[PDB]
Amino acid sequence: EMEKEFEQIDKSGSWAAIYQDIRHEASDFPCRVAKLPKNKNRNRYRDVSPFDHSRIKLHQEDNDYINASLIKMEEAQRSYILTQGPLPNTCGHFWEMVWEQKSRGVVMLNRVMEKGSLKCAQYWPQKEEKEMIFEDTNLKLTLISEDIKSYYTVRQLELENLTTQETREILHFHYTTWPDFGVPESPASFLNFLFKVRESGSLSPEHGPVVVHCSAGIGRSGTFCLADTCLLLMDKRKDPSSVDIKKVLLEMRKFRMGLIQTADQLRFSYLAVIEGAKFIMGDSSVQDQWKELSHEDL
Ligand SMILES: COC(=O)c1c(O)cccc1OC/C=C/c1cccc(-c2onc(C(=O)O)c2CO)c1
Numbered sequence: 001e002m003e004k005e006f007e008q009i010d011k012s013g014s015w016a017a018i019y020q021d022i023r024h025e026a027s028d029f030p031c032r033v034a035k036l037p038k039n040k041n042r043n044r045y046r047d048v049s050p051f052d053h054s055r056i057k058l059h060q061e062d063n064d065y066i067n068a069s070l071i072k073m074e075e076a077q078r079s080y081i082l083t084q085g086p087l088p089n090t091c092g093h094f095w096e097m098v099w100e101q102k103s104r105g106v107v108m109l110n111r112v113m114e115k116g117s118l119k120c121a122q123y124w125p126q127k128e129e130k131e132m133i134f135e136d137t138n139l140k141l142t143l144i145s146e147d148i149k150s151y152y153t154v155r156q157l158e159l160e161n162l163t164t165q166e167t168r169e170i171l172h173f174h175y176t177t178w179p180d181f182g183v184p185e186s187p188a189s190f191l192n193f194l195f196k197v198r199e200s201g202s203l204s205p206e207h208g209p210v211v212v213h214c215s216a217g218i219g220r221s222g223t224f225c226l227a228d229t230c231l232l233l234m235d236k237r238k239d240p241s242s243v244d245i246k247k248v249l250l251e252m253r254k255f256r257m258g259l260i261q262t263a264d265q266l267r268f269s270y271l272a273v274i275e276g277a278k279f280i281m282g283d284s285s286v287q288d289q290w291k292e293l294s295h296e297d298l
Helices: 002-009 015-025 037-042 091-101 185-197 219-237 245-252 261-278 286-293
Strands: 068-071 076-085 107-108 132-134 139-148 152-161 166-175 208-214
Touching: 002 015, 002 037, 002 076, 002 261, 068 219, 068 245, 076 091, 076 219, 091 132, 091 139, 091 152, 152 185, 152 245, 166 185, 185 219, 185 261, 185 286, 208 219, 208 261, 219 245, 219 261, 261 286
Parallel strands: 076 208, 107 166, 107 208
Antiparallel strands: 068 076, 132 139, 139 152, 152 166
């Protein structure tokens, strides 16, 4: 019936209003640690901070801060860690979190340079022979291989705890065609990407929460996590009718502020979910159609 509401809202162009209702009702919690003078240079955006109750703490004794939130979806049984695009001084902190939280995958939904502006540090190696060493957190990162597609790239990295010489394989999923404050070209390409992450096991419970990020870790990241959670709930009981997307987004906003930044991203979330439902309900051949429609082939 979410599709009914879609026709309704669309029919009466009330997405801006619907979206504003969610903002008026969104949770609001203190972000004291994020605002401490010492963590000023650890935040990319003044207006984007993690709540204290759900922030990820680095296991270091010096300063345990990092702009990241653990979005823990109870009913859905899935957790994601949303974070901002790392800054030049926080890449070490970024991989420390990945290691400490035991994440297997990292989903980047933005590009390093957007609209002629640096939206994220180049926190992973681009060439196999030039690995990166993060002196502050004592970690080493090596590009092992990368599969480049038309609008997204999947990299295989090796992360090594230089202190224990223990190594882990990290899968890096990079969506390169999602405009800042924009929406995927189509839900086909989006779902194709999402399912690719799902195929990798990165979202399994046997692994730490997958780390999701865009430039701030709220706009495009929210859109991604919302569609995934909604499709998962729908899957648990095979009942599209029992999935209240607006209510799910509100449940997510209790863990991090401003998930989904525009009324169009919200509208897209609906589209993505509705289309994704086709696969969840027994039509496994739609996944191939998405792959085709996406045109991932160079
Ligand atoms: C629309 O606003 C809200 O929903 C909201 C709210 O209801 C309550 C409290 C705070 C809120 O937003 C705070 C952040 C503004 C804000 C400021 C600067 C950048 C971004 C941003 O968001 N997503 C991205 C991306 O990389 O895709 C970016 C990168 O440019 C958001």
